[PDB]
Amino acid sequence: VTLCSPTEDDWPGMFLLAAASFTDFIGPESATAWRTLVPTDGAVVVRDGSEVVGMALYMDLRLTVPGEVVLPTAGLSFVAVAPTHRRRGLLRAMCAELHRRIADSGYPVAALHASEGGIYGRFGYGPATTLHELTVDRRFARFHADAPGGGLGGSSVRLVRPTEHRGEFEAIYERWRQQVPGGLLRPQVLWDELLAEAKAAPGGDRESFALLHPDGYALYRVDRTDLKLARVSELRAVTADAHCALWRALIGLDSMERISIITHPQDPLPHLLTDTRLARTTWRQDGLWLRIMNVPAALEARGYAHEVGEFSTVLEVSDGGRFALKIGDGRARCTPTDAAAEIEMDRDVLGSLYLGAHRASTLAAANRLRTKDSQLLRRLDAAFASDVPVQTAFEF
Amino acid sequence: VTLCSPTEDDWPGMFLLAAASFTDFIGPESATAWRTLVPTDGAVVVRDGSEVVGMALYMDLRLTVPGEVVLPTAGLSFVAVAPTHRRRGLLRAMCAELHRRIADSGYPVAALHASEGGIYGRFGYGPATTLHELTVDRRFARFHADAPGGGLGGSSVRLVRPTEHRGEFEAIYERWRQQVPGGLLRPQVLWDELLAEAKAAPGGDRESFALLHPDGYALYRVDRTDLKLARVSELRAVTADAHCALWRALIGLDSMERISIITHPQDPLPHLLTDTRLARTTWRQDGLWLRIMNVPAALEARGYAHEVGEFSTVLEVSDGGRFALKIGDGRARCTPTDAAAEIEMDRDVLGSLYLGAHRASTLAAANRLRTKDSQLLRRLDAAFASDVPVQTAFEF
Amino acid sequence: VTLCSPTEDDWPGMFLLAAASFTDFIGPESATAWRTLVPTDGAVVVRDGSEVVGMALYMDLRLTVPGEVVLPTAGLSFVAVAPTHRRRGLLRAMCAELHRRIADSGYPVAALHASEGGIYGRFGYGPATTLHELTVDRRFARFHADAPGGGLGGSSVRLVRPTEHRGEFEAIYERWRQQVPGGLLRPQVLWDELLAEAKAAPGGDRESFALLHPDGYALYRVDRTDLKLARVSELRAVTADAHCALWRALIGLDSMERISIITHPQDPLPHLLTDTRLARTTWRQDGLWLRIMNVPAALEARGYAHEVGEFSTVLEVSDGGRFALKIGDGRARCTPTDAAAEIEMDRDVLGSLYLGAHRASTLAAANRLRTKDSQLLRRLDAAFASDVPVQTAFEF
Amino acid sequence: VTLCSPTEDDWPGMFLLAAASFTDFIGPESATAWRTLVPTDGAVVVRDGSEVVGMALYMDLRLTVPGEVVLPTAGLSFVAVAPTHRRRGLLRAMCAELHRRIADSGYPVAALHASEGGIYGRFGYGPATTLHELTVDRRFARFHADAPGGGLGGSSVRLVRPTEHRGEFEAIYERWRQQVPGGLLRPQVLWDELLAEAKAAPGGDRESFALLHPDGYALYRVDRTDLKLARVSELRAVTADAHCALWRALIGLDSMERISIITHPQDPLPHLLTDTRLARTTWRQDGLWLRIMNVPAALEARGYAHEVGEFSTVLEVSDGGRFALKIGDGRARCTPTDAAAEIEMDRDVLGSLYLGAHRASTLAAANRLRTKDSQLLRRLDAAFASDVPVQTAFEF
Ligand SMILES: CCN(CC)CCNC(=O)CSc1nc(N)c2c3c(sc2n1)CCCC3
């Protein structure tokens, strides 16, 4: 049981573990595209004696954080331990080695999507975005008098084939990801993969269609089994006008009973309708998880709310350092100190605060965040909050 | 078809309409208790020719708003139109008369719980609290190392019969309702009714039990049909310690698979567990709806966030007046003006902002709130936000 | 194993067999009411050695047949064989004795509601009415421009308590039953029983309400478990205006999603709506079964369609006689003959034709009815058809 | 937004709208076959500016009406409005243009299958056939002593592969469609398509088998997911003997629990069994919809019941003309008149009466058909009734 960077000859063994560990695994062909995002020493495997019994890697990503700042991000992925080798310290050993490499390589943050919610907290990852499924019973849906784009004349939205308008989706997404916390750069190879999933599969998913606006798009397909349900896989809108116009078109899918989408808690859709209740929350879950690798770099890199007045405090991260944190004029300065801590929290908690999805006050109430000053709590809440609601880009 | 205040002889007809309109109607005996909260001219009926074909009333309530300010509140309730008399203007006529009476009587706000979400917006009511059902699979639930009250020694929580500890529930609730936005005074007659519902009914609900802490309680019963589900009807906790200790006791209901509760979006429960995902959101809906009757009085009465610096603007409510709004040092001044509006919104939108459940930014994105200044938007968001998360007291 | 008329001392044993044989059995108290409809020698029991192991009886009923003719009808009921004594000839023996008594007493027809559809054909009973369940999704239901009673002014329908308007229901039902084939006289004791079932039961059925028009009524209650479903137990309407007005009121039950009713195949409800499809047929089944006891008397007693021109034929009923049947001017003459048969059928088939629910042509296609002349077939179809659609009165 | 006949270059855009509008759409290959039934100017499209945002067409069909008369019929089909262009008058505009073309081309009737039941009434289409799903629990099914084809010797029914007996199916269907109201000529290209659907699809429908009699056939396949359910896609039988023999063979599918078929309300199947109840009606819906284009031509073309004696009346169709209607000896004469109307109805109502699926009396009770003479009503009922029960041929 030794731990190594994989060679080319290890990858058939890694794909076998992948097929056995991940039910949603698309085979080796699609893996080629994703592999191009893995840097030279971005992967570790565990061999027994040899067969691959453990693997983990990270991908080079670009993540937007509040203030429209783009951080280099290590995207943990393809993590698997063979069912033959559970409870053997393998996950801990692989995660430790990758975090060492990630830290040394100079990434300020790491990120992942969690298969289970009970695993990654102990390795310093905190849930940082919230997925929110809305299901609209579109048969009752009427738009409010106040909703944009309800005037006479032609529609600005076109119904199109995804593969024939790649350039427009790319450009709209690029604009979206740069202005929204949680945004990820989507490289060319992932557009290739996305548009491949758009066509129908024999005994699989139905054909995808697109609704295209100059400042937004929606990709949707009819569900495999529920033929009265349309699933919006992705809706990206840069303006409120685009968002409303796309939803006017989706509600116009008259052969459907229900439209579902995985969105974020601050999606304005409910408020566009005369009956807000028709946009039912059918599902909620953690989206992106963040591990802050370098506390000073991460805290100094993001923007903070201009509304809160300048304040200073001392933050201790458990086994992560202690810092003099000064926030004012939407910027933070974060420097070493041995002064008494005013705020303590584990590393995972900081990840949860970092994009503004969770309030300091809420985490304080669970005692995941410890302070004796409730004024400081309010100031943290306000400072770390995000002007632009945090969203989830794409799963990896 | 005339509109009158009911006499004693109208009430049998009103109870008949009630039994036919409300499936959850407890009969005339329980109605006696609720009736004591209806003031002298708090009710209207419509007769044909005579039989009661329409009714509506309000109750005298006390509602806590941000800054722990308690407002006299007209609680609209018992609203019904006979199925024989739909689409006849009756709801509009009854609501107009009651709003006249409520306004003239000097209530700054009216409030209701909505049977449907598409009805009450046009009468100036906006959803102001959010109900959030969490279902915990308690078989997997483990408390985080950081969670309070996990030390050795005895428990501070007692398992008791509700009817034998009325005084303690009353006193704990009184403390709770005064410090939480959305809190309602629960008068003696509603405690009588609550503790009557606590006992088992033949072929109905099972017996209720209570978990009692010095600074919190939980009332729960096993579900009628799903005998592995415990439903928490009510949990009131004044400290984080009480909240955690009550949840340690609920997770200790070892004969149950699942514990469900209707709570609020900022309930810290998920953060008390090592796996936040185990607290699944199974249901979300509008709670209390508010109609601001008097804009200046309401806006001046509540507290605002101290974090945001002093600012001035001009607010227009559609057919509700235009006001110079000045907010600073957590207080607002709201005075008449004919200066150009910087913010416009319908009356219902203001109700939705008033307890801090919805962000101005979110409503702006749906164009329910119109301004040309995005800095002003951020300032409104921050100012109207509530330090203490808004919760829902009891349905009426 | 002997067969006797029961004495008073046999009835506790009969109630025991009843409770064990019929899940819907209301106990001995309600049985008192039904017992008053059983004539002196209207019942048979089988004892072993003694305990009651078999029973059957008939009740004195009055049944409306086409031409608004009311026949004395033997209503077979309370038929049961102990589970200890199956496959022992007991049903055959009891049915033979009762049919002897019924014939000798001078009833032209016997009738029953069948627990199973495979039992009663061999004893000469044919299904003669069709039950048709319609479920309306009332949220989408809009009335057609052509539908009666859509004008301004007050409603003619009142929402009332059943027990306070007994006289009006009685009188409306009396008018209904006399003008509709399948109508049964409902005696006073069955009104007592019907209005007793109208009140709520602890852990049972919910309270019943009534919609009352001068020329019709509907009795309905919310379903026990599906609280968005209203079940119409009974709707009796003497005019099209009443029928439409009652349905306008039922569609006005705004707290319900669905209204269901057990009606007949020619219920005009679907045609009152702009979307006929909203009245979905969710269930179909045989209603009343008829055994023609005396062929000549039965065939001469009913009216026939005036449209078909006079014709003569020879009808043979298998082991039931052969007859010269002459039909003209809406009347039949039916006399003995030994002339060659032009039409043959079993006795059960004639029962199925008798109220016009089934077409001769349809039964001919199954070869349940044999003739070599297709012109005769068309003439039978037309002659036996009912001007007024056949309906089902009440179960017994 | 202009309205044109499509060119060859419009058809890729039409197929895109089709794939997005119709979930059951087989792609462009199968569309080639259906296209051959569309005449030169049988189609309209709406372009914006260009992309296809609206389309509609008709196909040249031959429809059998009572009296075995075959009418040229315009089969409306492939109707779709883009979800981006709802509530824009497009359906109304396309339907108006096609009806103009259909009328001018000399079709007496148009016909369609309705995606929803609330759409096509306002354009003068009335539901004219009823689909009736029967589900037989074949484990209990026993044939009645009277049922044909229960004697000793060999079976007349063969189990075969559909594709190897095309000629026999074609010839049997041709005989069927010519003698049954609702029958449609099935051209060669639709036989090609039907037999292509008969083979198994990977992750789709299972292989179809055929039961073949000299005077009937049944096509059936095991359901995708319910492997104890056999679905009869099509059963065509020219004699009662064939119908019974095919059902004896279907009940002999001993590996199945249930056989389902979409048939018509007068299917004799229930009467072939000792227990009629085993043939449960699981589903009912409108089949073919008719719009009478030319009232005189349509009414003069069909045969009427010989049983009713000669009578004369005056029929007014709303915005469709007024006519002296004389019916006798199974033929109608229909000529212009300005004499006072004795019968009024909308155009859609006449379509519903035309094949005898709905009774005049029933439509009168809903006030869709207005007369003051109830004798006239009875005469219409009898006259328009169909000797041969109306059935549904194939969907288009
Ligand atoms: C399949 C992994 N899955 C289960 C935990 C996680 C969620 N992933 C997705 O939703 C997009 S599909 C995908 N994603 C990759 N990161 C990858 C990688 C591949 S294939 C591939 N496919 C090869 C090496 C780089 C990572």
Ligand SMILES: CCN(CC)CCNC(=O)CSc1nc(N)c2c3c(sc2n1)CCCC3
């Ligand atoms: C039954 C009304 N229901 C349906 C819309 C609304 C929700 N109400 C509850 O969840 C508590 S039960 C209750 N509530 C009342 N306000 C009242 C009133 C009564 S009984 C009564 N019971 C008589 C007059 C004052 C209001």
Ligand SMILES: CCN(CC)CCNC(=O)CSc1nc(N)c2c3c(sc2n1)CCCC3
């Ligand atoms: C209970 C019998 N049931 C099961 C086969 C048949 C259907 N009957 C009903 O839907 C009305 S309840 C009823 N009906 C009776 N005929 C009777 C009789 C009684 S109780 C009674 N209750 C005593 C003797 C006369 C018949």
Ligand SMILES: CCN(CC)CCNC(=O)CSc1nc(N)c2c3c(sc2n1)CCCC3
């Ligand atoms: C797909 C249309 N569908 C949805 C409303 C209606 C029902 N149609 C069927 O059940 C047989 S499949 C079919 N039918 C056509 N008429 C057509 C036509 C095609 S493909 C085709 N396929 C191209 C032009 C002529 C009509």
